[PDB]
Write a protein that binds this ligand. Structure first.
Ligand SMILES: [Mg+2]
Ligand SMILES: [Mg+2]
Ligand SMILES: [Mg+2]
Ligand SMILES: [Mg+2]
Ligand SMILES: [Mg+2]
Ligand SMILES: [Mg+2]
Ligand SMILES: [Mg+2]
Ligand SMILES: [Mg+2]
Ligand SMILES: [Mg+2]
Ligand SMILES: [Mg+2]
Ligand SMILES: [Mg+2]
Ligand SMILES: [Mg+2]
Ligand SMILES: [Mg+2]
Lengths: 271, 114, 88, 70, 101
RNA sequence: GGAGGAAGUA
RNA sequence: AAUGCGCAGAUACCGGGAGGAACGCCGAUGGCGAAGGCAGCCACCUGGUCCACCCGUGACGCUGAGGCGCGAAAGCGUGGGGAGCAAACCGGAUUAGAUACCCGGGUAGUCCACGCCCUAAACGAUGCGCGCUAGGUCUCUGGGUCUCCUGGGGGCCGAAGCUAACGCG
C-alpha cells in the first residue's frame, strides 16, 4: 500500500509514498470554520524549547472534532476522505442532517455516504462514537477522553487501535497502543474503529529533504559536540561516550523511569 | 479459614513427587503435605511409600481443626496415586467422592522433547 | 452458483438443432461459461492454487474441440468465436 | 456388556438436539463411544459425530464429565 | 435463496419482557435480510451440561428459514453482538437421514 | 507365522 | 543429584481476568487430491472424480521436448503476533575430557498477511494411456427387488508368467 519508484536518481531508489487509493479525488478543504492559522518552532521567549525543529512547509490547520458529545442523537453522513498534514491519519469531512459540517479522524474500513452517529444508542459499525460503559468488550476503539468531557486524548495516530478488556464499576479497562492497562471512566466518549493509514510506518523518506519538509530539522549528535554543549564531548577522535550515556542537560537516557512516582495517575495503571 | 468439620482434599502426583492438599467445600485451604514435608528428598519424593506418608501429615492437621468426612479430587497419573487414596480412604476421615480431574488436553500445547 | 436457467439458456442458444444438449459447439459454450465464471473466482481467492489447475484442464479441454471444429468445419469456427469473443 | 444402535428406534442421527438419544453415545466421561461399541457403520458414524460435535456446541453435551470411582 | 436452520440460545435469568424484547430483535432482523420464516421450535430452557457464561441454564430458540446465501454470514454479525445472546449457530437444511429403520 | 502402528564403556 | 526456584510467602487450591497457538474420543489398517500435502464446528465461493438414465456430438483420442503453474520442512525480505516447544548462546551433572545424549534458562523460528529460494528417502526409490492373463479375502463409495449382480478405490495370500534373487501378481 505504497508507491515505490524506479532508481532514475539516488534517494528515489528506496523512497516510498503513501496510499491515496482512498482519498476522495479531492484537494480543497471546505474553508468553513475549519481552516485556521499557524505558527513556528519555539516558544514565547524566543528560546528554542524543543530543538531541531522549524522550516518545513506551509500548513493550514483542520478543526478536528474530538468532542463528539455535542451532536448526540443527531446523525450524520460521511462525505469525503481528506488529507491532513498535521496528523499521521487522514480526516473525514462528514455532513450532518442538521446541516452542519465537521471533521473526524479517518478510521479503517470507513466508506462514503455511510451513516455515522454519536450517542449511547448508536450501533457498533465503525465510525460511531459513544461512552465506553456502552461499548462492548474486545472492541477496537480510538479517540478516547481520559477524563469525561475533555476531548479525545488517547489513540488517534495512524493505524492505532485499542481494545476493551472489561468493566469495573463506573470505570473501564483499556489497552493502549503502548501497552498500559488504565482505569478510565465509563462515561468518556470514544469512537469505534481503528485509525486509517496503517501503512504510515511502512513509508520511507528516501532522502534528506523529506526530513526537512516535515519540520524535523537535521539532528546533530552529541559525540561531535564539545563538552560545553554536550556531555559526550568526543575530544580526540571517535573516542567513546566516557560514561554514561546521557543527554545535553545531563540526565542519562538509557533506562531512567522519568515518570513521576508520587503521582495520582499511577493509581489507575498497570504498566 | 474457618474451623469446620466438612471439607475437601486434593492430590497431585508427579512422576517424581505427590504433593497433596486439603480444603473445605468452598475453596479456602488449610493444610497440605508432600513427599518432602514428610521428610524425604530427591527421587525418594516419587516413591509411593513417601506419597502414602504425605497424606498422613495431611490427615492430621485437618483433624486438628475438627474434620469428619472429606472429599477426594485426584489430579495426576504417577505412582503416588492410590497410595494416597488408600491412605485417605482409611485414615479417619470418610470420603464422599473419588473424583479424577487429571488434566487431559485436546492436543493443543506442544510438549518438551519428552 | 450455477442454476438450471444458466444451462438451458445457453443450450437453446447453441443447440444447433433442438434436443442438442451437448455438441462441440455447445460443449465449448458450456465450458466457456464456467471458465468466464471460474476465472472471476480466482480473482478474489488468488491463493486457491488447487482450483486453478482444473481451469487449465477446463481451458485446455476447450483448447481441443475448437481444434476439432477448425479442423473439420472452418465455417462454424469464427462464426462461434465472434459470438463469445474467444482466443486472442 | 452389549452395545446400543438397535436399542434406539427411528431417531434422526442428523438431529443435533435429541440429547436423550445421545447421552448414551458418550461413555461415562463424554468421549464418543467408538464404532466398535455402537454397532454403527462407516457413513453412520461420520454423520453422527458431525451432529454430536454440533450438539456439543449448543451447550447440550459435555466434553469431559469427571471420572467417579476408578 | 436456500433453506437454513438457525439456532438461538439465551440467558434464563430474565423476565418475559426482556425475554420477549429479544425475540423481536430476531424477528425484525430476518426481514432486514429477507428470510422466509417457516416455523420455530421455541422448546425453551434446558439445564446445560457445562456452564456457559458460568450459567448452566439457557432459553433455547429455533427458526427454520429460507434466506438467500448472498446475505447470510453477515447476519450473525447482527446477532452475536447482543450480549444477552451468547450462543448462535446456523446450519444448512440437513435433510433427514434414516437410522434403525 | 506374516503387516501395521526398556542399554554405563573403550 | 545438582544448576534453578523458594521465609521477599512459592509448589498444590478456589474465585476472576488476559493471550496465544492447536483440535482428545470419533480416528482406522479409512477417505480426498497430480504431487506437496489435508483432521474441531458453521457458512460463502470453488475444483476434481464416481454411479444410473440407451439423450447428444461423432475419433474430437494418448503421450508430450521447450514453456507456464503448484510444490512439505528449513531459510529470507517487510509488517505484525508470541501461551507452549525450541536451533544457536550460558550454566548443572556423567566423563579420561563432553564443543553431545540427561536437566535449569533461553533468542531466532514454528503462528498471520504479502512477495521470494523450488530443494528432498518428493518413496510405491515403480512416468502416463489402453487391451488381454485364475482365483480367494476384509473394507471405503454408488447403483440395481439384494448372504445376488455390477462400477469406481485401499489393504492381505496366492494361477501362469517374470527376476540374480528378495519379490511382483
Ligand atoms: Mg537523494
Ligand atoms: Mg524550540
Ligand atoms: Mg529537517
Ligand atoms: Mg534529520
Ligand atoms: Mg547525527
Ligand atoms: Mg568538533
Ligand atoms: Mg523448554
Ligand atoms: Mg436438519
Ligand atoms: Mg438421520
Ligand atoms: Mg517454597
Ligand atoms: Mg539469530
Ligand atoms: Mg528472497
Ligand atoms: Mg484373452
Amino acid at each position: 500500500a505504497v508507491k515505490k519508484f524506479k532508481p532514475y536518481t539516488p534517494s528515489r531508489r528506496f523512497m516510498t509514498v503513501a496510499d491515496f487509493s482512498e482519498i476522495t479525488k479531492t484537494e480543497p478543504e471546505k474553508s468553513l470554520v475549519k481552516p485556521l492559522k499557524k505558527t513556528g518552532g519555539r516558544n514565547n521567549q524566543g528560546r528554542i524549547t524543543v530543538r531541531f525543529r522549524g522550516g518545513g512547509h506551509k500548513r493550514l490547520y483542520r478543526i478536528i472534532d474530538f468532542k463528539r458529545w455535542d451532536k448526540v442523537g443527531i446523525p450524520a453522513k460521511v462525505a469525503a476522505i481528506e488529507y491532513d498534514p498535521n496528523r499521521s491519519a487522514r480526516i473525514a469531512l462528514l455532513h450532518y442532517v442538521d446541516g452542519e459540517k465537521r471533521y473526524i479522524i479517518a478510521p479503517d474500513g470507513l466508506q462514503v455516504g455511510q451513516q455515522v452517529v454519536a450517542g449511547p444508542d448508536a450501533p457498533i459499525q465503525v465510525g460511531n462514537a459513544l461512552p465506553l460503559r456502552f461499548i462492548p468488550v474486545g472492541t477496537v476503539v480510538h479517540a478516547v477522553e481520559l477524563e469525561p468531557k475533555k476531548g479525545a486524548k488517547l489513540a488517534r495516530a495512524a493505524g492505532t487501535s485499542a481494545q476493551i478488556q472489561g468493566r469495573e464499576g463506573d470505570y473501564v479497562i483499556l489497552r493502549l497502543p503502548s501497552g498500559e492497562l488504565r482505569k478510565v471512566h465509563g462515561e468518556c466518549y470514544a469512537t469505534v474503529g481503528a485509525v486509517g493509514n496503517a501503512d504510515h510506518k511502512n513509508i520511507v523518506l528516501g532522502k534528506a529533504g523529506r526530513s526537512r519538509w516535515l519540520g524535523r530539522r537535521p539532528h546533530v549528535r552529541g559525540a561531535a559536540m564539545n563538552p560545553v554543549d554536550h556531555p559526550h564531548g568526543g575530544g580526540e577522535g571517535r573516542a567513546p561516550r566516557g560514561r554514561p550515556p546521557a543527554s545535553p542537560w545531563g540526565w542519562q537516557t538509557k533506562g531512567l523511569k522519568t515518570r513521576k512516582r508520587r503521582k495520582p495517575s499511577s493509581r489507575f495503571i498497570i504498566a | 479459614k474457618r474451623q469446620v468439620a466438612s471439607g475437601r482434599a486434593y492430590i497431585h502426583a508427579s512422576y517424581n513427587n505427590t504433593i497433596v492438599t486439603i480444603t473445605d467445600p468452598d475453596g479456602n485451604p488449610i493444610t497440605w503435605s508432600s513427599g518432602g514435608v514428610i521428610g524425604y528428598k530427591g527421587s525418594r519424593k516419587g516413591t509411593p511409600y513417601a506419597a502414602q506418608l504425605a497424606a498422613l501429615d495431611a490427615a492430621k492437621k485437618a483433624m486438628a481443626y475438627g474434620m469428619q468426612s472429606v472429599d477426594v479430587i485426584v489430579r495426576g497419573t504417577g505412582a503416588g496415586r492410590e497410595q494416597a487414596i488408600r491412605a485417605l480412604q482409611a485414615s479417619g476421615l470418610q470420603v464422599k467422592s473419588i473424583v479424577d480431574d487429571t488434566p487431559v488436553p485436546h492436543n493443543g500445547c506442544r510438549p518438551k522433547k519428552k | 452458483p450455477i442454476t438450471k436457467e444458466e444451462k438451458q439458456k445457453v443450450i437453446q442458444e447453441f443447440a444447433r438443432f433442438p434436443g442438442d444438449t451437448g455438441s462441440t459447439e455447445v460443449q465449448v459454450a458450456l465450458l466457456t461459461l464456467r471458465i468466464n465464471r471460474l476465472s472471476e473466482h480466482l480473482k478474489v481467492h488468488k491463493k486457491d492454487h488447487h482450483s486453478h489447475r482444473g481451469l487449465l484442464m477446463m481451458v485446455g479441454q476447450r483448447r481441443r474441440l475448437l481444434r476439432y471444429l477448425q479442423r473439420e468445419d472452418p465455417e462454424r469456427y469464427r462464426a462461434l468465436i465472434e459470438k463469445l469473443g474467444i482466443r486472442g | 456388556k452389549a452395545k446400543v444402535k438397535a436399542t434406539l428406534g427411528e431417531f434422526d442421527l442428523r438431529d443435533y438436539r435429541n440429547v436423550e438419544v445421545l447421552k448414551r453415545f458418550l461413555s461415562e466421561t463424554g468421549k464418543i463411544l467408538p464404532r466398535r461399541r455402537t454397532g454403527l457403520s462407516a457413513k453412520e458414524q461420520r454423520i453422527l459425530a458431525k451432529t454430536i460435535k454440533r450438539a456439543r456446541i449448543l451447550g447440550l453435551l459435555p466434553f469431559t464429565e469427571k471420572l467417579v470411582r476408578k | 435463496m436456500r433453506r437454513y436452520e438457525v439456532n438461538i440460545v439465551l440467558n434464563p435469568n430474565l423476565d418475559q419482557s426482556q425475554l420477549a424484547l429479544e425475540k423481536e430483535i430476531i424477528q425484525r432482523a430476518l426481514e432486514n435480510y429477507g428470510a422466509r420464516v417457516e416455523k420455530v421450535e421455541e422448546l425453551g430452557l434446558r439445564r446445560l451440561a457445562y456452564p456457559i457464561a458460568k450459567d448452566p441454564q439457557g432459553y433455547f430458540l429455533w427458526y427454520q428459514v429460507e434466506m438467500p446465501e448472498d446475505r447470510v454470514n453477515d447476519l450473525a454479525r447482527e446477532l452475536r453482538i447482543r450480549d444477552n445472546v451468547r450462543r448462535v449457530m446456523v446450519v444448512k437444511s440437513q435433510e433427514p437421514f434414516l437410522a434403525n429403520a
